[PDB]
Design a protein around this ligand. Sequence first.
Ligand code: HEM
Ligand code: HEM
Ligand SMILES: [Mg+2]
Ligand SMILES: [Mg+2]
Lengths: 299, 303
Amino acid sequence: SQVQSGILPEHCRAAIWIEANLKGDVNALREASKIFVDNVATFQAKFPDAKLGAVVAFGNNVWRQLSGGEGADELKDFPVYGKGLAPSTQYDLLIHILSARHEVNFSVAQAALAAFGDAIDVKEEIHGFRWVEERDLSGFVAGTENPAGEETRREVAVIKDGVDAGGSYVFVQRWEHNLKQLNRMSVPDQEMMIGRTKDANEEIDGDERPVTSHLSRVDLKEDGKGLKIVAQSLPYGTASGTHGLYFCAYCARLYNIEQQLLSMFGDTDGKRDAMLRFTKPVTGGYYFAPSLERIQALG
Amino acid sequence: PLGMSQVQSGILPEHCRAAIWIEANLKGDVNALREASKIFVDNVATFQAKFPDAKLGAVVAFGNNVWRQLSGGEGADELKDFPVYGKGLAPSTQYDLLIHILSARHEVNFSVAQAALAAFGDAIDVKEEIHGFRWVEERDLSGFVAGTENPAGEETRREVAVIKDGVDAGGSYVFVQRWEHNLKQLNRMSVPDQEMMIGRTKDANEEIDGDERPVTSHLSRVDLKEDGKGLKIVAQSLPYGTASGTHGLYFCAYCARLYNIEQQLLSMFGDTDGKRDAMLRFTKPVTGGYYFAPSLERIQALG
Ligand code: HEM
Ligand code: HEM
Ligand SMILES: [Mg+2]
Ligand SMILES: [Mg+2]
């Protein structure tokens, strides 16, 4: 089973995420998905330098229909976390496009919209960009502990066997940063909020940083085994309007993502991520990304 | 370089892949713009030093009312608020301040835009912020190549865009106008009909002779000569928007005289000969403003 092309690429410069609801017959998604994955292959051949990839992924209700109820055992609608502190905006379809070249991504996004046509209702379209020094707009480097290299990224993100082999679970969550609130914090206070130093990007020892620090919330182990995810997140927005991080992660099980969210939003131990001092999530959804062979076998 | 006037760095660069434009109104006393503009151009120099490979430039430019105040009424003789053209076919949304940032790196442009906002602070009310991107093959989102006849090279671009002498030497006039394309409407037109609308062939970008295209074609509207002398402008326009939402062309041009821009607008919008640009069949302008970009030396004499 071959993995969709947008899960594994590293260090992308730009992305487009489109989140949409199904308005028409669920069966219209079958032909549209095949059209789109062929478009992606054609664009990769036309723009080899772009290192383009893309993913089509499906919400719980749609995917149960498309799959006949087989597999994707962990899939569910995204719930609130923290009783609502993390909101839920579960849609039916996610299209994630990434590459070195925003302009290529834009053409690919137009192709996705042509493939799905008026069967879908676009609810969100976000254009991500890698910022200076791969920093989040807060000024902290983002991506350091992300699984590195195809071998490890496959291990973390790609389902190994059975009916879902080559697929992955996806989580997307848009955050809105209040950089004015951030900038009122001293740099040492910001560093204790994240759990790494700001300029030099060195981890602060877990025994010496707050348990509410981001790293303490999300660097989770189960009897010594890390709960890893493959992030594809990027900055987005305008300088004068809304801006933040579009969080996007892939994992061979939803479990690892969910444990991190239960931790961040106070459900596990009553403590909340210190980043909520300056940024907040405003969307959230879970999706299942089938393998390419599974997509071809739809219609 | 005493006794000379240095152009702001964003007027002349060619083939930059990314831009940010910010348009804003002044909220309080115009004096706030003096120290903010000096800070901003200094920040630009710092970003150029930090990111030499970005090939970054930027411009700060001013609307008529605030430029008249800051200049004491000296110079900028052609400057005026952007008029409506075609009785409203081209709307007017004249603001007080234009920031234009362009480079080979969107991420550097973003940092520079943040610096501009920090410099001006609450003295301004941002009315729009547009992130331009060069599309594939330098095409407009309509699919036609954009930029072919734009003045080429530093020498010619300086001749067209940069005022040569007098108090305004090193300055330029700026026009910005955001267009919203209806690509569904465009795609209802056959490609031959689109070519007659533009005046060039779509795939190969060959000019269609003036006698073989309608007078409403875009090239017939805007390729204007006065007794054989072309009325040139230096465009810095780029595509913008989302695939599923608003998208189009953010039109931006610089010229040493506002006259050349105005003649093209009077032509496009029906004021000269009663005919209008065929591109209005699929796209429309929704903003419009004129600004004056002083020389970099003069931004330093503010205060
Ligand atoms: C505003 C939103 C977020 C910001 C700004 C942010 C920022 C960061 C930063 C600066 C780091 C440290 C550098 C690195 O290793 O990448 C980090 C690490 C990490 N983040 Fe986040 N993050 C956000 C949301 C999330 C969410 C929602 C999750 C999971 C559901 C998450 C999971 C992780 C993980 C697993 C790590 C690596 C921890 C480690 O093993 O050291 N992050 N994040
Ligand atoms: C929807 C907005 C616009 C679109 C899509 C558009 C597109 C084009 C295209 C495809 C060309 C031919 C290729 C080239 O030489 O660049 C062109 C040329 C040109 N455009 Fe536009 N344009 C727009 C607005 C404007 C405006 C508002 C003006 C002036 C006020 C203008 C002035 C020019 C000029 C002077 C030329 C060169 C003509 C020549 O000498 O051959 N354009 N434009
Ligand atoms: Mg660790
Ligand atoms: Mg000509």
